[PDB]
């Protein structure tokens, strides 16, 4: 989920951009607090969350993955962000308050990604 010894990870300019620029902008947002941790279905009394959502994802998981060099490329990390937003939309009603918070974070996400370096390039430590 967060770490995998058998799967290769890399550091790229786009991945570090997602960690330094995109993640830090979304993490400190006022609507970020519901998405900073995995959905605790037991504490929240949601017996159907893990049976409707087959791949849970949160900003805390994505942030730990960037800090552990989990991803090989930026497309894997942006898929996690999309998965997190899709899980909120699928599970909740389109008029729910939590959906408005996710849409606010998604627009900011798409705004920051629009200024990402165009070509992915690996960053190697010397």
């Amino acid at each position: 989920e967060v770490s995998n010894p058998k799967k290769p990870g890399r550091v790229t300019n786009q991945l570090q951009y997602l960690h330094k620029v995109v993640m830090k902008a979304l993490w400190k947002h006022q609507f970020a607090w519901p998405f900073r941790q995995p959905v605790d279905a037991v504490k929240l009394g949601l017996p159907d969350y893990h049976k409707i959502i087959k791949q849970p994802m949160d900003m805390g998981t994505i942030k730990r993955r960037l800090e552990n060099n989990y991803y090989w490329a930026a497309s894997e990390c942006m898929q996690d962000f999309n998965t997190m937003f899709t899980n909120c939309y699928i599970y909740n009603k389109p008029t729910d308050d939590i959906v408005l918070m996710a849409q606010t974070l998604e627009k900011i996400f798409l705004q920051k990604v629009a200024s990402m370096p165009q070509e992915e390039q690996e960053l190697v430590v010397t």
């Binding site: 607090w33 605790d40 504490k43 929240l44 009394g45 949601l46 729910d96 308050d97 939590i98």
Partner: peptide, 15 residues
């Protein structure tokens, strides 16, 4: 701020 899930999420946050 008004939804069941969001308020339940808020109750757990204070813990």
């Amino acid at each position: 701020w008004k939804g069941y899930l969001c308020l339940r999420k808020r109750i757990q946050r204070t813990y």
